[PDB]
Amino acid sequence: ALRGTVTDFSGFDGRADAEVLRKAMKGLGTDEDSILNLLTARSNAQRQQIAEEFKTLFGRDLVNDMKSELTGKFEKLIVALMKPSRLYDAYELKHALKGAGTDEKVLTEIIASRTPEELRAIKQAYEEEYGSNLEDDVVGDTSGYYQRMLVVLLQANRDPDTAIDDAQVELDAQALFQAGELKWGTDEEKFITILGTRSVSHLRRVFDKYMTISGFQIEETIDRETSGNLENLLLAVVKSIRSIPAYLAETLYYAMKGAGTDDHTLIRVIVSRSEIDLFNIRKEFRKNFATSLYSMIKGDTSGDYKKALLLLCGGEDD
Ligand SMILES: NCCOP(=O)(O)OC[C@H](O)CO
Ligand SMILES: [Ca+2]
Ligand SMILES: [Ca+2]
Ligand SMILES: [Ca+2]
Ligand SMILES: [Ca+2]
Ligand SMILES: [Ca+2]
Ligand SMILES: [Ca+2]
Ligand SMILES: [Ca+2]
Ligand SMILES: [Ca+2]
Ligand SMILES: [Ca+2]
Ligand SMILES: [Ca+2]
C-alpha cells in the first residue's frame, strides 16, 4: 500500500552515469542541469554505485566534488540525496543533537514517525557511524517527560497488532480520561505508557471510544492538558498512529505555508521518504489541503533546487 516517487532506473549503467557527472563538472562552470536530472532519477542505491564508479574511474570523490561546485540550498539537497538511505535519519538526528542547543523538531519528527523496525536500524547505524549511543545523546540533550517519551519510543518496543480486545480498548480510553480531563493537573506517565507502547491497531480504537466517552478527540485533550515539547511530541505520536503519511504531509504543509520556507524540513521529508511513501504523502496532502504538493513547492522554491524538488515529487495535481 505505501509507495515512493523515486525508483530504480531501468537500464542503469554506473559507469555511463559517472562520466556524465564528471563531464557535468570538469573545468569552468557546472552544468547543474545534467546533475539534477541524473540524480533525481536514480534510486539511492544507484547513487551509491554511481559514487563507486566515479572514484574507480577518476580517483576523485563524487560528493566532495559536487560540494565544491554547487552551493546554497541546491548543494544541501543534492548532499541529502547522496546520503545512503540507512544513514540519513541517523545523520539528521546527530546534527540535531550536536552543539549546545538541540532542535526538538527533528527529534520529535523522526522518532515519532518512524516505525520500531526503523528505529532499530537508526540506532544500529548511528552507533556504528558516530560511536555514541543514540539514547544517551537524546537523554543528554533533553529533560522531563519529553525525554522520557522519546526514550520509551527509542526502545522500539511497541506491542504487536494482535486481534483486538474491546475490554482493553474501553479500559484504556477510560484511564486516559481519568489521567487528563477528570484530573486536576495531569498524569503524563499514563499518557507515555499507553501512547508509547500499545499497538497501533489498538490505539486507533482507543482514540475513537475515548471520543465517545469524553466528547473530546485525544488531540484536543493533549492540547488542554499539556504544553511545550511534550504537547508536540504527543500530537506527533497521535498523528503518526492515525497516519504517518498524513502526519508528514501535514509537516510539509507548515513548512511551506509561511513567511519563508522551512527549507531543512522540506528537504529532509522529501528525501527521507522519496522511496518509502511520498506518493501517499502526496495523496493526503491534497485530500487535506486542497493545494497539491507540486504547486506548493512551485511557488516556494526557486532555482535548480525547485526543479530538483519537483522532479523528486512527481505528479502535479497528485
Ligand atoms: N483544562 C485546564 C487544565 O489544567 P490542568 O493541567 O489539568 O491543571 C493545572 C495544573 O495543576 C496547573 O499548575
Ligand atoms: Ca567546474
Ligand atoms: Ca552554473
Ligand atoms: Ca559548495
Ligand atoms: Ca545539544
Ligand atoms: Ca531547544
Ligand atoms: Ca538530560
Ligand atoms: Ca487535567
Ligand atoms: Ca503531572
Ligand atoms: Ca497546550
Ligand atoms: Ca512559503
Curated annotation (Swiss-Prot):
Note the segments forming the Annexin repeats: 12-83, 84-155, 167-239, 243-314
A GO MF label:
calcium ion binding
Q: Which residues carry this modification: N6-acetyllysine?
A: K67, K73, K76, K94, K98
Glycyl lysine isopeptide (Lys-Gly) (interchain with G-Cter in SUMO2) cross-link, renumbered residues: K26
Give residue numbers for the modification (N6-succinyllysine): K287
Q: Which domain of life is it from?
A: Eukaryota
Keywords, in A-Z order: Acetylation, Annexin, Blood coagulation, Calcium, Calcium/phospholipid-binding, Hemostasis, Isopeptide bond, Phosphoprotein, Repeat, S-nitrosylation, Ubl conjugation
- Where is the PTM Phosphoserine found along the chain? S34
Q: Which protein family is named in the record?
A: Belongs to the annexin family.
What is stated about domains? A pair of annexin repeats may form one binding site for calcium and phospholipid.
Q: What is this protein called?
A: Annexin A5
Species classification: Eukaryota, Metazoa, Chordata, Craniata, Vertebrata
